[PDB]
Design a protein around this ligand. Structure first.
Ligand SMILES: Nc1ncnc2c1ncn2[C@@H]1O[C@H](CO)[C@@H](O)[C@H]1O
Ligand SMILES: Nc1ncnc2c1ncn2[C@@H]1O[C@H](CO)[C@@H](O)[C@H]1O
Ligand SMILES: COc1ccc(C2(C(=O)O)CC2)cc1
Ligand SMILES: COc1ccc(C2(C(=O)O)CC2)cc1
Ligand SMILES: NC1=Nc2cccc3cccc(c23)N1
Ligand SMILES: NC1=Nc2cccc3cccc(c23)N1
Ligand SMILES: NC1=Nc2cccc3cccc(c23)N1
Ligand SMILES: NC1=Nc2cccc3cccc(c23)N1
Ligand SMILES: NC1=Nc2cccc3cccc(c23)N1
Ligand SMILES: NC1=Nc2cccc3cccc(c23)N1
Ligand SMILES: NC1=Nc2cccc3cccc(c23)N1
Ligand SMILES: NC1=Nc2cccc3cccc(c23)N1
Ligand SMILES: [K+]
Ligand SMILES: [K+]
Lengths: 331, 330
């Protein structure tokens, strides 16, 4: 039995800078709504100068997913690179404080720690503007091989295909994980990210480097360049062992071969801020999966965690997911 | 015309905010509901024990200036950060609110001040503050033209902890009064009053301070009494105008023998009391510099304070001017 970790996640280590804005702000600043918009240093300074008073919170898609696993009671670890600066110190504090193993060492102060300026519109949608900074230094040297060897599932972001060398680390992870009889998982991350790396993502799935794939509706449609969601579901099921496809207020569908399991979204009092929804869906799913739960129950746990996170500001739940799971009889 | 309605002066701080259970405060010997000063070693120790947190620009007077600007008043701020990432955040957030903020960092060490604020289930907040770069604030940071051009200059009693900030405040009072402006202070915290009781009374009695803000505990501490009626009578004799807050019991505004009682607004839930007194001062000073009655100044103060305690973080994320309009106050 005993493994050190249930879930290792790997991603871009980012601190979020969060502000509300009106619809017009996105138009005026040519920010693509609901997407991850990469920005350079000059653009980061420009947009920040236009941004209202903000709140900061540790983010990073995989970072949030690890934190959610820990919160639910699972044993989690994280690889991601910050700088030796104050923002890096915040990031390091927050993930470790959640009880996630995080030991990736900063390489210097420059490039500085990544930030994402996240603008939340009145509908609760979030539009992200990300300066990768120190994330560009993540590489094979940051793979703690003993950790990957000792984790039931290693999960990574499609977003890692933007920085130059992160993919090399991910291939090393797949090798180690599979040599030790573990599973690999990825999230498609963002529809434009899928547009950038479609062929490579399909290759990861078809070659068996990735066993479990997370997607939302838009990402699945983007993967196959279709407007037919039924086609997207059929094709994703043929390309990976297990696929979990989220559909916002329409819940989720879990696919395995010919098996399909539909899960309802939970009741939401209000959509405060959708930042982190997919990340926490993956937390709940991977927690259930590494606890030996049915695929339906993994879906239920994902929907519970995702529904909780969209009802607060900030991407990591500030309430106990394990308590919520117990109350919900998912346990 | 005047360039500024309200200049505020205080310790420039970034808040690090987390929820905790009651036992956490006991285990760590944190005085509940108070501002606990800490050194660098203690800051590192407490942070190592603190859960996942959120960061938000803070500082009592910083928050008050931001609230004035949010309501539609014109505000300025003096307070010192370091030339570091946290200082950049502080500078961004206050300027982004439309507050004039031009105090220059002096170096990277000491680093920008932080306050670890632990919020218990009752919504109470217990603050643990490393002053850092705030110790550098001095007379060199007084923009004399700004003080000369501000209807009211308001400062924190908290400024009596760093070594040289009081010298800046004395220069401010001289400049403000030479130009026919008014000076105001908040007593800040009951333990801060215990430290500087005599000096605070002197500021009031010598006329350096015209308008004083206090909560119930601070007023009791100022006169070392358990009798709130005594405290109200004495504070009214010591300053021209006193605004005394009483949490869910609202506020009372005193001027000479005049008293004006104002009700607290109705709230959905006490989420986090951080900033309540700072935002009461925002609403009061906004109304005051708009020529409003003292009762209406109190009403604006209670509105702003009630709004801020229903959110996480010390500066309202919603429009105070819109709320005031809806409440029929503007
Ligand atoms: N390029 C990126 N790579 C990984 N995570 C990101 C990226 N841009 C934004 N995020 C994170 O996505 C999270 C929401 O899913 C936010 O907490 C934010 O930090
Ligand atoms: N010593 C201090 N001086 C001034 N403001 C402080 C101090 N300690 C905490 N604060 C601020 O008090 C605010 C709440 O009134 C918080 O936003 C916090 O930054
Ligand atoms: C508000 O977000 C950002 C602001 C600034 C940055 C830079 C930095 O040097 O810190 C310019 C690259 C990066 C991100
Ligand atoms: C969490 O709050 C703090 C953590 C650390 C600090 C020090 C710093 O050098 O930044 C040690 C003084 C100061 C505040
Ligand atoms: N935002 C910002 N980033 C900087 C990075 C490096 C050097 C600088 C010099 C002046 C102002 C800056 C920077 N402003
Ligand atoms: N990187 C960089 N950013 C700047 C932003 C604003 C002003 C500057 C002045 C000099 C050098 C700079 C900056 N260098
Ligand atoms: N802020 C910060 N400064 C550092 C300087 C030198 C080494 C470090 C190592 C880890 C984290 C750091 C530093 N964080
Ligand atoms: N070595 C080193 N470690 C740090 C850890 C956390 C914060 C820091 C701030 C300044 C310098 C540091 C650190 N130098
Ligand atoms: N503030 C601070 N200064 C240090 C100097 C030298 C060594 C340290 C080791 C841990 C934490 C430190 C220090 N924290
Ligand atoms: N937290 C922390 N702060 C530091 C400030 C300055 C120097 C340091 C050196 C080592 C470790 C540190 C620090 N750890
Ligand atoms: N982060 C940061 N670095 C600085 C380096 C040198 C001068 C500064 C002046 C203002 C703000 C700064 C800096 N903020
Ligand atoms: N001079 C200077 N100004 C800055 C302003 C804001 C952010 C910075 C980051 C690094 C270096 C800086 C700055 N150097
Ligand atoms: K959220
Ligand atoms: K608050």
């Amino acid at each position: 039995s005993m493994t050190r970790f249930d879930v290792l996640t790997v991603g871009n280590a980012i601190v979020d800078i969060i502000s509300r804005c009106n619809d017009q702000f996105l138009i005026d600043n040519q920010i693509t709504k609901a997407a991850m918009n990469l920005i350079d240093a000059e653009r980061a300074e420009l947009l920040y100068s236009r941004m209202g008073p903000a709140l900061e919170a540790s983010g990073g898609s995989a970072g949030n997913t690890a934190a959610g696993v820990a919160n639910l009671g699972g044993k989690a670890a994280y690889f991601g690179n910050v700088a030796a600066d104050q923002l890096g110190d915040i990031f390091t504090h927050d993930i470790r404080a959640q009880g996630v193993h995080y030991q990736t060492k900063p390489k210097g102060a420059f490039p500085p720690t990544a930030r994402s300026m996240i603008f939340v519109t009145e509908d609760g949608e979030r539009s992200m503007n990300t300066y990768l900074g120190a994330c560009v230094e993540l590489g094979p040297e940051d793979v703690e091989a003993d950790v990957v060897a000792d984790a039931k599932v290693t999960y990574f972001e499609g977003y890692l295909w933007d920085p130059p060398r992160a993919k090399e680390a991910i291939l090393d992870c797949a090798r180690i994980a599979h040599q030790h009889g573990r599973e690999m998982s990825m999230t498609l991350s963002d529809s434009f990210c899928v547009d950038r790396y479609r062929g490579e993502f399909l290759d990861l799935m078809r070659s068996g480097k990735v066993d479990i794939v997370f997607a939302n509706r838009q990402e699945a449609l983007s993967l196959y360049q279709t407007d037919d969601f039924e086609e997207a579901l059929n094709r994703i099921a043929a390309d990976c062992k297990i696929a979990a496809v989220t559909m916002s207020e329409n819940g989720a569908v879990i696919l395995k071969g010919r098996e399909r399991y539909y899960v309802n979204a939970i009741r939401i009092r209000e959509v405060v801020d959708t930042t982190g929804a997919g990340d926490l869906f993956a937390s709940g799913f991977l927690y259930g999966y590494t606890q030996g739960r049915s695929l339906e129950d993994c879906g239920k746990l994902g929907c519970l965690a995702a529904g909780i996170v969209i009802q607060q500001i900030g991407p990591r739940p500030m309430t106990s997911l394990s308590e919520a799971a117990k109350q919900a009889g998912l346990i």
